[PDB]
Amino acid sequence: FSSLPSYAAFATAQEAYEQAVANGDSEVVLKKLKKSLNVAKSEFDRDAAMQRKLEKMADQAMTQMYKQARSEDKRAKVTSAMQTMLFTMLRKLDNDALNNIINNARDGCVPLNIIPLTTAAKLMVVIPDYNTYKNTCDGTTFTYASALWEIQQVVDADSKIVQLSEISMDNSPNLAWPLIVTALRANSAV
Amino acid sequence: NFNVLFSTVFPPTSFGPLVRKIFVDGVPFVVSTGYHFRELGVVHNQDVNLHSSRLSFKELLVYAADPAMHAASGNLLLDKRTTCFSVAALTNNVAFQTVKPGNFNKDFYDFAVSKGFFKEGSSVELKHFFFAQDGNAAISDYDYYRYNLPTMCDIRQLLFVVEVVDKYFDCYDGGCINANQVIVNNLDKSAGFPFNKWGKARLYYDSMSYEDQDALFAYTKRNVIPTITQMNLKYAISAKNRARTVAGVSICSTMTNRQFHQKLLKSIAATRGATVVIGTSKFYGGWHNMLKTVYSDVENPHLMGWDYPKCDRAMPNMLRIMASLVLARKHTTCCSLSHRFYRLANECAQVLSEMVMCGGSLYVKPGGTSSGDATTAYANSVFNICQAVTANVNALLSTDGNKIADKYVRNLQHRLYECLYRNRDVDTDFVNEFYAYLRKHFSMMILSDDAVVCFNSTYASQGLVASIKNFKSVLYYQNNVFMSEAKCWTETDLTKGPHEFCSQHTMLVKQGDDYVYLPYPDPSRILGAGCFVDDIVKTDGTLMIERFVSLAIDAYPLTKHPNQEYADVFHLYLQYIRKLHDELTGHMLDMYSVMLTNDNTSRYWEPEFYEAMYTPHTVL
Amino acid sequence: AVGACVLCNSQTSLRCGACIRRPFLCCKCCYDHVISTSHKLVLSVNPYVCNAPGCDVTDVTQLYLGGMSYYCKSHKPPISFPLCANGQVFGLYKNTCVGSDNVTDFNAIATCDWTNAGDYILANTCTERLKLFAAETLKATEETFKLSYGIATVREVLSDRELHLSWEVGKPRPPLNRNYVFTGYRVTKNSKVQIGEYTFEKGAVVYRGTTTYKLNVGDYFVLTSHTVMPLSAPTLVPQEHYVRITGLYPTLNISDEFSSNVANYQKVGMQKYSTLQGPPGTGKSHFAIGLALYYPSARIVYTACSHAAVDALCEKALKYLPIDKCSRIIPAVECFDKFKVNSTLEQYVFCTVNALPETTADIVVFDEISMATNYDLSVVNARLRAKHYVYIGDPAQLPAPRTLLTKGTLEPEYFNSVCRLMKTIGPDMFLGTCRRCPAEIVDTVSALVYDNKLKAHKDKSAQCFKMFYKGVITHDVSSAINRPQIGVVREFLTRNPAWRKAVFISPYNSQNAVASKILGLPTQTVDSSQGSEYDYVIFTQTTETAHSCNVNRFNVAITRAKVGILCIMSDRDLYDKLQFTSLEIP
RNA sequence: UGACUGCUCCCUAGCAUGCUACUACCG
RNA sequence: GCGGUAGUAGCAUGCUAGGGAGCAG
Ligand SMILES: [Zn+2]
Ligand SMILES: [Zn+2]
Ligand SMILES: [Zn+2]
Ligand SMILES: [Zn+2]
């Protein structure tokens, strides 16, 4: 803002004109002073305006390109995360029972609702009350979905271990009742 | 219609996505390559490749939204809390979610009490609170889908009601738009499951460039992509103590539904003077204009309003299909015949019957609407118009034609029967005639399952126009609900507007020289919003003074009410605003030394700033 | 799109577009590289090309920035701004640059199309990242050159040791032996199908591979060109002689595999690297085997440069070290699978640098330094980050298949950075004990390059033969033939009964194929055939030109045979240097 | 853990247009 | 003598972008 190309000419002309004015010369030198300084300031005006426009344009361009780079970095990391999640969840497919039921299909297509029903290794049961409990998972082994399951653990709504010896009719009102029962496939998968 | 009836015989485990095994660089996957609908039969994908190299970004997005892998890599689940079908459990624990109470603003309550409020025997009292819920509330609320039953329809009458509804939806334009013309507001909201583990919608709208979005949108015109919906509990003020739940749809569904429907949705919300009043505001004389439009030139005017019990849990599937088909009728040039069917199949597989994730488990949604998709309110309006039209048809066709004095109405009834049960193709002249008859004798104003009707009264008494009983019968035999007439009103004096529309009452006041209609809310709602807040930082008024300015804007028209406490609410709000401002200025000048000025701040505690919001002169 | 520039290490966003490897260039460096060189393309988060519709300019010094896009002189708006100004290109982090003065040598590296000796002189004469960039671009240009070849159109097969195979039109016959591996992939209907890892013998096509497939229709034999990944670690890590033996545990007893192996450990236990300077059959094999049990509680890695040279890599390891302590790494081509594959926890892993299970160690051994480039040193230093390691190999061996250079031979000083590192300051180790060899190789290679630090262990009976025959050379194709070999094999087996079961060094593999077709001798590769030599070998004439005979191709060829080393004087060899027995042909 | 729409108020930044003003150039 | 043009300052108007908040279905 102080070393512009026209600054040298403008300042030198102003200094010379004002020295001539301080010399106390005639009115012709004053008119020449006025004209020269007017045109000098007029030419300095656009040189002082266009540069300021250009700097702000350049700054906006820099900011936009920086934010584009940040967006690309975020895209790369989200792609890596999705790939990792897929390849991690792949490793639990039990690729022998799944293959055994896929090959029985006449064209390779099977409903999705029967894959956990015939290939899962673990079963989870949520029981509202004792009357429902004694009709579904009474004892230590029960049958569901044409398979045999054996109990492995029982917890309550607070996630604390509960032993089957205290799930009775008298002791029912002393438990956080949304009980969760975990079982394993017997003779088949786990 | 026939598929709906025939699908009730076959086992329920043979419906849904169909999966198979594909190979990517020698490793086996499990992906969905089709669907088996209860209504649309068997649908197979068109672009499926078994052997492929390393996959791209949009393939990752598609494979990460499919429920196939999540269901196949999870444990079996047998849930006895509900009677809906259960698929699998994604973890080893069950999640129980509670709802917390509200926060008490003691300063406002003390200020209100010190001014003669909340006395015994008063007509203004608090009945809006924050209710708390226990652990097993989300599943208990989800178990209300048991009211959705398979319903067969009268096809020869639905095929005419749909024509009349399409006549109603005729003044708009629509079609498909490119990915660079989509307008999204608030990109800082959730993206659904499983996309909420890595960021909000901003991350996925920035990481995806324009031709990626275009390719993804063009992918769903030849394939079906099933997704997963997450259920969340609301934390808001209310007057009843039942839990409220909304549905969070996945990003892959919203991103394409916007490109499919946004042009028509924006064209609907920009028209004034139509039947659907979505987009019209109530400030600057909007309410008066809407009320004058709905009155039209009916001859013996009465007013009527009704209510839908369990509107979204009990709406049959066929009406949702009809609403989607009616909305998708603007694509006669931009889309082919197979593209439209595949778009319909995608919509059905994503927002009508899909896997929902409640707690930490996957369930099967029987039917109904999932409030939270990209086209909720407009579909609700289409459904409301359809129900009104069939109620009118049933009212007219079930009248002894030997006692109709007017011969024009008798000929109209004869032609209606002929066009329903003796004509196989559309007859446009009679559709236009019936539409004109309905618009002359039965005027409606619809906003997403809320409606006000101005109808001819002598015609309704003689049975030539629908009544409340007709709505009750239609709801009973077509919606599987009972509509008690204790939630419906009727007004025989037009100088007092509708008894209730969008939770607002109507009063006819004199402003300027003429008389206009103004809406006012329930005072208890305003006071409850004042006294009970979510967040702790809103129990310090000086930090947020702009809350009370908006609350006083909402409560202005209460000063014209003949009852006296109603105006006292507005005056109390103004005095509290002034007290808060004085507190801020003095409380800041004291310990610090910053001196505050009261330039153009006194406008907020004088009535002229608020009076200008209900006077017809558009501003800003 | 964001990283450090190869000279100032400052953050940049500009990629040069005229260099095949697209390096990261600093803004001042970008200006210097674009001004003093005809590299006039620059890439950023968006390309620096004119975006005016219908226009096509790809300069950088010609464009003007206007609005949000980039424009040229013919489409600059009234609000324009030149990108190339102030001697500094417009990009991110433009105010946090420092510049550099090493731009002339960087320009030479970038501009060098790899033609003459000075190419490798300046490749080995620069700073670290320039060495890495030069090695990367050298492998890039050689792999592009070899992928600029046709596809072997095959539709039928005669039998084993026979083949009809056709190249493309306008494409010449590719190089012959396993030094240029033939691994192709055919198609059945929709994708590619397996063919086999093979190599061709002559033009009759015998199979020197290691499998047999039902080869016929639609077969595509190709010299598979592989995409080169960028380097991470430098070619070598500067060593510092330790005082503590951290992790290393000299056992209470002495596992006396070899005697001087104690000194081996004594000076390899403190410096960050070492090297096994081994003449052929002079302890180049099992000093690491002794180290295996003297330092049994130290994670020890073994590697080589080619899948062919795994003989001593794999034999004594299972022969004498415990079974479980060994481990195998093989991609799944055909090689020794003697140890266990798919095992991450072990103390003795044996493999090549092709593919390893990423881990770090504290002791490594690395074989075949002669045909090893700085790229291989960098990749072994990146995959394995250890505390000490040894590079087995000797300068008195063969260079890598650097067919790129044609004018000047690549001498010991130009093998790689380490191979001259031990040349200038001296080798880390120097042995002088030949395991089983008469003193012929002693005299020869000790007068030539061994400086006579090893002397006569086995007696010199002077049964080896060298004659006065010269030979005549004739070129036909990229392989040549020798009439004074088609006749000379017979003329040299006329009555001498000792070299009938000798091995045939192959400066020209086609000549060896013809010799096998006519008389019949085993084919012996030149570069990747160390340790496969038998007790008895013939060094044949096979050439007179600068193909093989300056110094360093026969330094190991003189050691192929043990007692009967028939090394006839072929061409301008080291004739008047020693004593050799001779018999004159009739 | 926080869905889809619609309307309204407040604060800051930029752009466009208009009004007035102060110098200077030109006829 | 009048007008045009070039900067500079204050004021007003409508859009776009960002942030905070309120109501309704
Ligand atoms: Zn369309
Ligand atoms: Zn370059
Ligand atoms: Zn630099
Ligand atoms: Zn151009």
Short mmCIF file of C-alpha atoms in Angstrom, two decimals, chain B residues 10 50 77 82 126 186 204 231 287 299 332 361 367 420 434 563 573 581 615:
data_model
loop_
_atom_site.label_atom_id
_atom_site.label_comp_id
_atom_site.label_asym_id
_atom_site.label_seq_id
_atom_site.Cartn_x
_atom_site.Cartn_y
_atom_site.Cartn_z
CA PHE B 10 -48.28 -68.41 3.25
CA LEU B 50 -21.01 -62.28 -8.57
CA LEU B 77 -33.51 -63.68 19.30
CA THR B 82 -44.09 -58.10 22.00
CA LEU B 126 -50.68 -25.71 34.50
CA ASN B 186 -29.61 -28.22 8.83
CA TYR B 204 -21.84 -37.96 3.65
CA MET B 231 -36.53 -45.64 16.61
CA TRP B 287 -55.21 -16.83 8.96
CA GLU B 299 -75.15 -21.83 0.57
CA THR B 332 -44.74 -38.95 -17.30
CA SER B 361 -32.32 -55.78 18.19
CA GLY B 367 -47.09 -51.96 7.94
CA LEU B 420 -68.50 -47.25 -10.45
CA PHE B 434 -68.35 -34.78 -9.58
CA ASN B 563 -61.69 -13.15 29.82
CA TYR B 573 -44.51 -11.61 29.73
CA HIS B 581 -33.23 -6.40 30.57
CA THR B 615 -51.52 -6.67 10.40
#
